Amino acid sequence: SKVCEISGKRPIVANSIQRRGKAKREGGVGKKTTGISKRRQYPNLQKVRVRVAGQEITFRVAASHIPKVYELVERAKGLKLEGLSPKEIKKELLKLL
Amino acid sequence: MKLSEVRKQLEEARKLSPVELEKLVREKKRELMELRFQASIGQLSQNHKIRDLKRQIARLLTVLNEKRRQ
Amino acid sequence: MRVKMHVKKGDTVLVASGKYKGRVGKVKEVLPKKYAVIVEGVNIVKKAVRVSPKYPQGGFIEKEAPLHASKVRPICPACGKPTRVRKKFLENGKKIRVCAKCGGALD
Amino acid sequence: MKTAYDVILAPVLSEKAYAGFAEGKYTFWVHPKATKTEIKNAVETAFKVKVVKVNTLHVRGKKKRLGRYLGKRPDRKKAIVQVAPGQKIEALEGL
RNA sequence: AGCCGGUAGCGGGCGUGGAUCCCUGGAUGUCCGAAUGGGGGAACCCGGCCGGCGGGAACGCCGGUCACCGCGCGCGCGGGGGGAACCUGGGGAACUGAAACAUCUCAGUACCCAGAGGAGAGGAAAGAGAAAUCGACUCCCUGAGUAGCGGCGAGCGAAAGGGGACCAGCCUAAACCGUCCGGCUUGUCCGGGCGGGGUCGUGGGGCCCUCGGACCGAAUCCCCAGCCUAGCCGAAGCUGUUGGGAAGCAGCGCCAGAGAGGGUGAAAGCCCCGUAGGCGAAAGGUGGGGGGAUAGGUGAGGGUACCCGAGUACCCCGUGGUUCGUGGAGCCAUGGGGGAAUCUGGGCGGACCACCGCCUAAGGCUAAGUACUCCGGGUGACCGAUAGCGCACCAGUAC
RNA sequence: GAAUGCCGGCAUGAGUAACGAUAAAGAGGGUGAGAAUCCCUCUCGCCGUAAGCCCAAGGGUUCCUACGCAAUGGUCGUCAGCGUAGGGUUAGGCGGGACCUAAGGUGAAGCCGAAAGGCGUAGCCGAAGGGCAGCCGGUUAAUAUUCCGGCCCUUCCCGCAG
RNA sequence: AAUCCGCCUCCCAACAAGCUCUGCGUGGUGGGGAAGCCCGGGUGACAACCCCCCGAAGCCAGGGAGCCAAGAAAAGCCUCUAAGCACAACCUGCGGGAACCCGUACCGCAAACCGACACAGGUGGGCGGGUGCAAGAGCACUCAGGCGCGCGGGAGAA
Ligand SMILES: [Mg+2]
Ligand SMILES: [Mg+2]
Ligand SMILES: [Mg+2]
Ligand SMILES: [Mg+2]
Ligand SMILES: [Mg+2]
Ligand SMILES: [Mg+2]
Ligand SMILES: [Mg+2]
Ligand SMILES: [Mg+2]
Ligand SMILES: [Mg+2]
Ligand SMILES: [Mg+2]
Ligand SMILES: [Mg+2]
Ligand SMILES: [Mg+2]
Ligand SMILES: [Mg+2]
Ligand SMILES: [Mg+2]
Ligand SMILES: [Mg+2]
Ligand SMILES: [Mg+2]
Ligand SMILES: [Mg+2]
Ligand SMILES: [Mg+2]
Ligand SMILES: [Mg+2]
Ligand SMILES: [Mg+2]
Ligand SMILES: [Mg+2]
Ligand SMILES: [Mg+2]
Ligand SMILES: [Mg+2]
Ligand SMILES: [Mg+2]
Ligand SMILES: [Mg+2]
Ligand SMILES: [Mg+2]
Ligand SMILES: [Mg+2]
Ligand SMILES: [Mg+2]
Ligand SMILES: [Mg+2]
Ligand SMILES: [Mg+2]
Ligand SMILES: [Mg+2]
Ligand SMILES: [Mg+2]
Ligand SMILES: [Mg+2]
Ligand SMILES: [Mg+2]
Ligand SMILES: [Mg+2]
Ligand SMILES: [Mg+2]
Ligand SMILES: [Mg+2]
Ligand SMILES: [Mg+2]
Ligand SMILES: [Mg+2]
Ligand SMILES: [Mg+2]
Ligand SMILES: [Mg+2]
Ligand SMILES: [Mg+2]
Ligand SMILES: [Mg+2]
Ligand SMILES: [Mg+2]
Ligand SMILES: [Mg+2]
Ligand SMILES: [Mg+2]
Ligand SMILES: [Mg+2]
Ligand SMILES: [Mg+2]
Ligand SMILES: [Mg+2]
Ligand SMILES: [Mg+2]
Ligand SMILES: [Mg+2]
Ligand SMILES: [Mg+2]
Ligand SMILES: [Mg+2]
Ligand SMILES: [Mg+2]
Ligand SMILES: [Mg+2]
Ligand SMILES: [Mg+2]
Ligand SMILES: [Mg+2]
Ligand SMILES: [Mg+2]
Ligand SMILES: [Mg+2]
Ligand SMILES: [Mg+2]
Ligand SMILES: [Mg+2]
Ligand SMILES: [Mg+2]
Ligand SMILES: [Mg+2]
Ligand SMILES: [Mg+2]
Ligand SMILES: [Mg+2]
Ligand SMILES: [Mg+2]
Ligand SMILES: [Mg+2]
Ligand SMILES: [Mg+2]
Ligand SMILES: [Mg+2]
Ligand SMILES: [Mg+2]
Ligand SMILES: [Mg+2]
Ligand SMILES: [Mg+2]
Ligand SMILES: [Mg+2]
Ligand SMILES: [Mg+2]
Ligand SMILES: [Mg+2]
Ligand SMILES: [Mg+2]
Ligand SMILES: [Mg+2]
Ligand SMILES: [Mg+2]
Ligand SMILES: [Mg+2]
Ligand SMILES: [Mg+2]
Ligand SMILES: [Mg+2]
Ligand SMILES: [Mg+2]
Ligand SMILES: [Mg+2]
Ligand SMILES: [Mg+2]
Ligand SMILES: [Mg+2]
Ligand SMILES: [Mg+2]
Ligand SMILES: [Mg+2]
Ligand SMILES: [Mg+2]
Ligand SMILES: [Mg+2]
Ligand SMILES: [Mg+2]
Ligand SMILES: [Mg+2]
Ligand SMILES: [Mg+2]
Ligand SMILES: [Mg+2]
Ligand SMILES: [Mg+2]
Ligand SMILES: [Mg+2]
Ligand SMILES: [Mg+2]
Ligand SMILES: [Mg+2]
Ligand SMILES: [Mg+2]
Ligand SMILES: [Mg+2]
Ligand SMILES: [Mg+2]
Ligand SMILES: [Mg+2]
Ligand SMILES: [Mg+2]
Ligand SMILES: [Mg+2]
Ligand SMILES: [Mg+2]
Ligand SMILES: [Mg+2]
Ligand SMILES: [Mg+2]
Ligand SMILES: [Mg+2]
Ligand SMILES: [Mg+2]
Ligand SMILES: [Mg+2]
Ligand SMILES: [Mg+2]
Ligand SMILES: [Mg+2]
Ligand SMILES: [Mg+2]
Ligand SMILES: [Mg+2]
Ligand SMILES: [Mg+2]
Ligand SMILES: [Mg+2]
Ligand SMILES: [Mg+2]
Ligand SMILES: [Mg+2]
Ligand SMILES: [Mg+2]
Ligand SMILES: [Mg+2]
Ligand SMILES: [Mg+2]
Ligand SMILES: [Mg+2]
Ligand SMILES: [Mg+2]
Ligand SMILES: [Mg+2]
Ligand SMILES: [Mg+2]
Ligand SMILES: [Mg+2]
Ligand SMILES: [Mg+2]
Ligand SMILES: [Mg+2]
Ligand SMILES: [Mg+2]
Ligand SMILES: [Mg+2]
Ligand SMILES: [Mg+2]
Ligand SMILES: [Mg+2]
Ligand SMILES: [Mg+2]
Ligand SMILES: [Mg+2]
Ligand SMILES: [Mg+2]
Ligand SMILES: [Mg+2]
Ligand SMILES: [Mg+2]
Ligand SMILES: [Mg+2]
Ligand SMILES: [Mg+2]
Ligand SMILES: [Mg+2]
Ligand SMILES: [Mg+2]
Ligand SMILES: [Mg+2]
Ligand SMILES: [Mg+2]
Ligand SMILES: [Mg+2]
Ligand SMILES: [Mg+2]
Ligand SMILES: [Mg+2]
Ligand SMILES: [Mg+2]
Ligand SMILES: [Mg+2]
Ligand SMILES: [Mg+2]
Ligand SMILES: [Mg+2]
Ligand SMILES: [Mg+2]
Ligand SMILES: [Mg+2]
Ligand SMILES: [Mg+2]
Ligand SMILES: [Mg+2]
Ligand SMILES: [Mg+2]
Ligand SMILES: [Mg+2]
Ligand SMILES: [Mg+2]
Ligand SMILES: [Mg+2]
Ligand SMILES: [Mg+2]
Ligand SMILES: [Mg+2]
Ligand SMILES: [Mg+2]
Ligand SMILES: [Mg+2]
Ligand SMILES: [Mg+2]
Ligand SMILES: [Mg+2]
Ligand SMILES: [Mg+2]
Ligand SMILES: [Mg+2]
Ligand SMILES: [Mg+2]
Ligand SMILES: [Mg+2]
Ligand SMILES: [Mg+2]
Ligand SMILES: [Mg+2]
Ligand SMILES: [Mg+2]
Ligand SMILES: [Mg+2]
Ligand SMILES: [Mg+2]
Ligand SMILES: [Mg+2]
Ligand SMILES: [Mg+2]
Ligand SMILES: [Mg+2]
Ligand SMILES: [Mg+2]
Ligand SMILES: [Mg+2]
Ligand SMILES: [Mg+2]
Ligand SMILES: [Mg+2]
Ligand SMILES: [Mg+2]
Ligand SMILES: [Mg+2]
Ligand SMILES: [Mg+2]
Ligand SMILES: [Mg+2]
Ligand SMILES: [Mg+2]
Ligand SMILES: [Mg+2]
Ligand SMILES: [Mg+2]
Ligand SMILES: [Mg+2]
Ligand SMILES: [Mg+2]
Ligand SMILES: [Mg+2]
Ligand SMILES: [Mg+2]
Ligand SMILES: [Mg+2]
Ligand SMILES: [Mg+2]
Ligand SMILES: [Mg+2]
Ligand SMILES: [Mg+2]
Ligand SMILES: [Mg+2]
Ligand SMILES: [Mg+2]
Ligand SMILES: [Mg+2]
Ligand SMILES: [Mg+2]
Ligand SMILES: [Mg+2]
Ligand SMILES: [Mg+2]
Ligand SMILES: [Mg+2]
Ligand SMILES: [Mg+2]
Ligand SMILES: [Mg+2]
Ligand SMILES: [Mg+2]
Ligand SMILES: [Mg+2]
Ligand SMILES: [Mg+2]
Ligand SMILES: [Mg+2]
Ligand SMILES: [Mg+2]
Ligand SMILES: [Mg+2]
Ligand SMILES: [Mg+2]
Ligand SMILES: [Mg+2]
Ligand SMILES: [Mg+2]
Ligand SMILES: [Mg+2]
Ligand SMILES: [Mg+2]
Ligand SMILES: [Mg+2]
Ligand SMILES: [Mg+2]
Ligand SMILES: [Zn+2]
């Protein structure tokens, strides 16, 4: 329920629209709206744990960009990464975005 | 303090060293305390001298500051 | 920035208006913040003074009351006539007041 | 620059302060920020004595008015310094 | 040529050897405050380290320094907080109106929040939309209360085009080349950095052949004009008379690129301050105008089909935006699922299909015309102390 | 000319109700322009698990002295918690800080949330709890475990000896 | 890590002692010191300063017993050891030096605090003497101390 660290996908506000009646295309009188109220659509955030330069790195990422984490790991092979902390490894991977 | 005395005080102050300017400020600050004491017992009819000394001291510290900025 | 004064202490001025109009006298003092001058022997008033160290016996003194600076006009020391003042740039070149009727210096 | 003469402002002029001269206790107005230790040193290098005891108290300014304008006198600080046996501060012996 | 603020006085001083005062720069600038050594009930309290002072080791004082986060190889640079409105983004009501009320309205308003700057946003067509057309964006007029939207109720309400203001266009990613670094799965490798190259819709670029060898020029830097932050010169009236007083009345004059206005004892072109017309910066600020640098900018065929921005386009589901409230509902945006291609690629012209055309998405920047008024000035068929700002006065005070 | 309109002024009620505990007063002397009301003396009455004394909050010079009485004081006022001025608060040992932790607050690590922000073991802050060395007397118009006197004590630094 | 603490075993000591700490008394020494009289001070006075009794809810204290509802933390302190360092360091005695910041006036059951007021209201802790009433902080009187409540004078109806 927050922000994708890879895509920047973020919760958005959407309306919930309750309708009644038969649609005109089916020969009905038409749809009537018995209620419109705000709600939120969340990104499909999940955890992606991954080992890079011998250290466990955790990403909070929308499912749509799960493969983008592994791409960042692949491209990480060309980086002077060993000896660094997880916080510092993470910053490097994200910089390759 | 007349203008001529102020010009002259500045010329002579700008020839002293920082160490000399400090000793002189210290001397004038004891002079200023003595004026204060005489003022508080109503024995200083020439009260303008208190303002004069304080601005003398300010001028000296201003020159002390000149010499130490570069 | 500064109150403009066409007259100073102490040149010779004519008092050209008021009860003392026509009088000539020296400017004893100029009061820029009141835009007023004090002319010797002009605008005399009786002031009450209390019995005091300063004034034993008490009674009254005589004081010169200020005159609006526009009521007064300098007497040119060259031609001896009441004059508006002009400005002249010398060769220094400082600026001086000069008489408008002839051209003499007033200072 | 800070000197002994910035710490010691004036003597305290009162019957209670004068009562102290007879036993070597001299009372000054000192800078409100001044510490007992620095008042000790200030008195010693100004009056050429040895201080063996310092007492201090803050003196709050008196609220005063002039017509419709209520105000305050400045806050002050008093120091009573005890000088070594047999010593004196002739400037205050005054009287 | 006077001066030591409002502020007189007491008591003393200063100034043509140029004071007070006004402008610019500098110095000093206790403590609190983003407050940042640490703590804290703001303006207090308590420390580490280096140096100094005292007889000084205990104690205290003086100077320097010590928060956190971001970025870049312990050190540097940056950030933090504030600002009357104006601006953009992230969120986002209700009364009310519909003479009840729920969709709808009020309104993406009020307000909360983040951010920006003297503006901000937007901006160089995957545009418009029917002109065989136009040619970034912004802003004004108009188109037009039109087209439309709408419990087709109440109401809501475009765009194109035309007239104007201003004017300006650029940098990248990828192919390919070079170089450095490291990865382990040893090289014709893959990855990372840097440099070159390249930037477009008459499609453009790369590579390969063939042909050909100075003019433009910044939005960046430099100089200068001009401007601001003090100022200066500036024409011409005397006499009598009534009056406390002349500027009124009278006599005789004069100036005017100045007869705007305000003062002066009453009603003054010529007494004063000004006005018309002119003049002025060592210093700081500005400089969009002028000049100069620099950055950058630049051919034609033919072949090759190497590149042309991906969890993207595209389709479906849930919504938002638009005049569009599910409507025949396209377009632009996107939370979920599925998921391409590189010009013979792709998006659009209001379902959809064909035809015919328009355009080049998934990287970034970009003056000016526009908004506002804390601040300075100018001007009112604006107020004149119950008015005009809440405050003409020691008011965001007393209370 | 009216809006129980708004602001201000001034009336009526009216010399009326009231003057705030039914613990209570009387006289003499003094001061002074002025005295039921201030000072002094005698007498009387009231409180006395308080209506006396000490401390903490809160208040902030109201404390002491001199000079005052326009207003403040429910009358009066020469008086005063009122006006003007001068003076007055002194600590190694009392209280708090340079010590400790409580709830709670804050918060390296970490977790969460459109933004603002919400949480969070350690740590830190947080007292009227823990801890820690001063008793009695004298002195001032006004301070006193603070000044002084007597007799004691704590910590820190340095040094000596063990 | 530990020689400390915990656990097991043995010996002695153990309701004794020992060591230690606090209270109270005494204690070199320093103070105080009434009525009355006289003008807060002098005198009383070279003051005296002793005996008996009552006696706390306070002190010794971290005391004892009973009970169930089962009754803070951390530092100071002591002990153990680690890096270290063992010419140092710490401990004990003694000596000299050093010892900062803030509060302290005054009101404080009230005329100075909260109630618009010098307001019969509200405001936490300690001391709160004597006699009698069975006791007591109750009640009456009264000590020290503090007051008569900031309008009065008459009259003697409803
Ligand atoms: Mg729904
Ligand atoms: Mg339908
Ligand atoms: Mg049909
Ligand atoms: Mg419908
Ligand atoms: Mg999850
Ligand atoms: Mg997973
Ligand atoms: Mg998806
Ligand atoms: Mg998917
Ligand atoms: Mg000067
Ligand atoms: Mg001038
Ligand atoms: Mg005249
Ligand atoms: Mg005449
Ligand atoms: Mg000049
Ligand atoms: Mg300084
Ligand atoms: Mg005395
Ligand atoms: Mg010192
Ligand atoms: Mg103190
Ligand atoms: Mg003052
Ligand atoms: Mg003054
Ligand atoms: Mg004088
Ligand atoms: Mg004078
Ligand atoms: Mg000059
Ligand atoms: Mg300046
Ligand atoms: Mg200072
Ligand atoms: Mg600060
Ligand atoms: Mg700080
Ligand atoms: Mg802090
Ligand atoms: Mg040091
Ligand atoms: Mg010394
Ligand atoms: Mg030292
Ligand atoms: Mg320092
Ligand atoms: Mg420091
Ligand atoms: Mg911020
Ligand atoms: Mg902020
Ligand atoms: Mg800002
Ligand atoms: Mg918005
Ligand atoms: Mg946001
Ligand atoms: Mg929104
Ligand atoms: Mg908004
Ligand atoms: Mg809501
Ligand atoms: Mg509604
Ligand atoms: Mg409404
Ligand atoms: Mg309406
Ligand atoms: Mg309507
Ligand atoms: Mg309605
Ligand atoms: Mg209605
Ligand atoms: Mg209704
Ligand atoms: Mg409604
Ligand atoms: Mg709306
Ligand atoms: Mg608004
Ligand atoms: Mg901001
Ligand atoms: Mg502009
Ligand atoms: Mg912009
Ligand atoms: Mg932009
Ligand atoms: Mg483009
Ligand atoms: Mg038409
Ligand atoms: Mg709308
Ligand atoms: Mg148009
Ligand atoms: Mg047009
Ligand atoms: Mg224009
Ligand atoms: Mg153009
Ligand atoms: Mg290699
Ligand atoms: Mg690569
Ligand atoms: Mg490379
Ligand atoms: Mg090209
Ligand atoms: Mg091509
Ligand atoms: Mg450019
Ligand atoms: Mg002029
Ligand atoms: Mg003129
Ligand atoms: Mg006449
Ligand atoms: Mg005339
Ligand atoms: Mg005429
Ligand atoms: Mg004109
Ligand atoms: Mg005119
Ligand atoms: Mg005029
Ligand atoms: Mg006329
Ligand atoms: Mg007229
Ligand atoms: Mg005129
Ligand atoms: Mg002009
Ligand atoms: Mg001009
Ligand atoms: Mg070619
Ligand atoms: Mg290809
Ligand atoms: Mg493209
Ligand atoms: Mg991408
Ligand atoms: Mg959709
Ligand atoms: Mg729709
Ligand atoms: Mg809609
Ligand atoms: Mg429809
Ligand atoms: Mg639609
Ligand atoms: Mg289509
Ligand atoms: Mg989506
Ligand atoms: Mg779509
Ligand atoms: Mg095509
Ligand atoms: Mg295609
Ligand atoms: Mg599309
Ligand atoms: Mg489509
Ligand atoms: Mg189209
Ligand atoms: Mg431009
Ligand atoms: Mg701009
Ligand atoms: Mg613009
Ligand atoms: Mg404007
Ligand atoms: Mg203005
Ligand atoms: Mg008018
Ligand atoms: Mg008018
Ligand atoms: Mg008025
Ligand atoms: Mg008004
Ligand atoms: Mg009027
Ligand atoms: Mg108003
Ligand atoms: Mg104003
Ligand atoms: Mg006022
Ligand atoms: Mg009517
Ligand atoms: Mg009425
Ligand atoms: Mg009424
Ligand atoms: Mg009525
Ligand atoms: Mg009314
Ligand atoms: Mg009326
Ligand atoms: Mg009214
Ligand atoms: Mg009225
Ligand atoms: Mg009346
Ligand atoms: Mg009335
Ligand atoms: Mg009557
Ligand atoms: Mg009646
Ligand atoms: Mg009656
Ligand atoms: Mg009555
Ligand atoms: Mg009553
Ligand atoms: Mg009564
Ligand atoms: Mg009498
Ligand atoms: Mg009497
Ligand atoms: Mg009386
Ligand atoms: Mg009387
Ligand atoms: Mg009395
Ligand atoms: Mg009793
Ligand atoms: Mg109060
Ligand atoms: Mg007062
Ligand atoms: Mg007192
Ligand atoms: Mg007082
Ligand atoms: Mg009193
Ligand atoms: Mg008196
Ligand atoms: Mg009175
Ligand atoms: Mg009176
Ligand atoms: Mg009276
Ligand atoms: Mg009264
Ligand atoms: Mg009265
Ligand atoms: Mg009253
Ligand atoms: Mg009197
Ligand atoms: Mg009173
Ligand atoms: Mg008083
Ligand atoms: Mg008076
Ligand atoms: Mg006194
Ligand atoms: Mg002591
Ligand atoms: Mg303490
Ligand atoms: Mg310390
Ligand atoms: Mg602490
Ligand atoms: Mg702590
Ligand atoms: Mg954090
Ligand atoms: Mg928190
Ligand atoms: Mg916690
Ligand atoms: Mg601590
Ligand atoms: Mg603490
Ligand atoms: Mg405590
Ligand atoms: Mg305690
Ligand atoms: Mg203590
Ligand atoms: Mg003791
Ligand atoms: Mg007292
Ligand atoms: Mg005292
Ligand atoms: Mg003592
Ligand atoms: Mg030894
Ligand atoms: Mg172990
Ligand atoms: Mg013992
Ligand atoms: Mg004992
Ligand atoms: Mg004993
Ligand atoms: Mg004795
Ligand atoms: Mg006695
Ligand atoms: Mg006696
Ligand atoms: Mg005796
Ligand atoms: Mg005898
Ligand atoms: Mg005897
Ligand atoms: Mg009990
Ligand atoms: Mg027990
Ligand atoms: Mg139980
Ligand atoms: Mg227990
Ligand atoms: Mg705990
Ligand atoms: Mg601790
Ligand atoms: Mg070792
Ligand atoms: Mg010792
Ligand atoms: Mg300290
Ligand atoms: Mg203090
Ligand atoms: Mg207090
Ligand atoms: Mg005290
Ligand atoms: Mg006291
Ligand atoms: Mg007291
Ligand atoms: Mg009282
Ligand atoms: Mg008391
Ligand atoms: Mg009570
Ligand atoms: Mg009580
Ligand atoms: Mg009381
Ligand atoms: Mg009161
Ligand atoms: Mg009260
Ligand atoms: Mg009363
Ligand atoms: Mg009361
Ligand atoms: Mg009670
Ligand atoms: Mg007793
Ligand atoms: Mg009986
Ligand atoms: Mg009994
Ligand atoms: Mg009984
Ligand atoms: Mg009984
Ligand atoms: Mg009893
Ligand atoms: Mg009872
Ligand atoms: Mg009772
Ligand atoms: Mg009774
Ligand atoms: Mg009794
Ligand atoms: Mg009594
Ligand atoms: Mg009574
Ligand atoms: Mg009475
Ligand atoms: Mg009464
Ligand atoms: Mg009667
Ligand atoms: Zn002349």
Side-chain angles (χ1 to χ4, degrees), chain B residues 1-4 7 44-49 51-52 61-62 65 69:
Chain B
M1 193 127 155
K2 304 153 195 290
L3 276 197
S4 50
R7 301 185 206 106
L44 187 74
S45 49
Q46 289 183 342
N47 57 51
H48 75 288
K49 290 169 136 172
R51 198 166 297 170
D52 272 358
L61 293 179
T62 303
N65 198 270
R69 281 204 292 288

Side-chain angles (χ1 to χ4, degrees), chain D residues 46-95:
Chain D
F47 300 111
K48 297 296 190 293
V49 296
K50 179 75 148 54
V51 177
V52 307
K53 189 184 171 60
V54 185
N55 288 36
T56 63
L57 47 72
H58 287 271
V59 183
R60 301 175 17 165
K62 292 176 170 181
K63 291 178 182 76
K64 300 298 207 177
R65 80 176 50 91
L66 189 66
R68 37 171 309 157
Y69 311 105
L70 321 184
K72 224 195 82 267
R73 294 215 182 112
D75 295 334
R76 287 174 306 177
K77 191 177 189 181
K78 276 197 297 196
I80 294 143
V81 309
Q82 172 71 261
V83 302
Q87 301 195 330
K88 61 169 171 63
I89 304 178
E90 193 58 54
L92 264 64
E93 300 291 344
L95 293 70

Side-chain angles (χ1 to χ4, degrees), chain A residues 61-76:
Chain A
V61 56
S64 70
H65 286 63
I66 288 188
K68 218 78 202 319
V69 167
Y70 294 84
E71 155 171 348
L72 276 193
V73 183
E74 293 273 24
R75 309 177 52 184

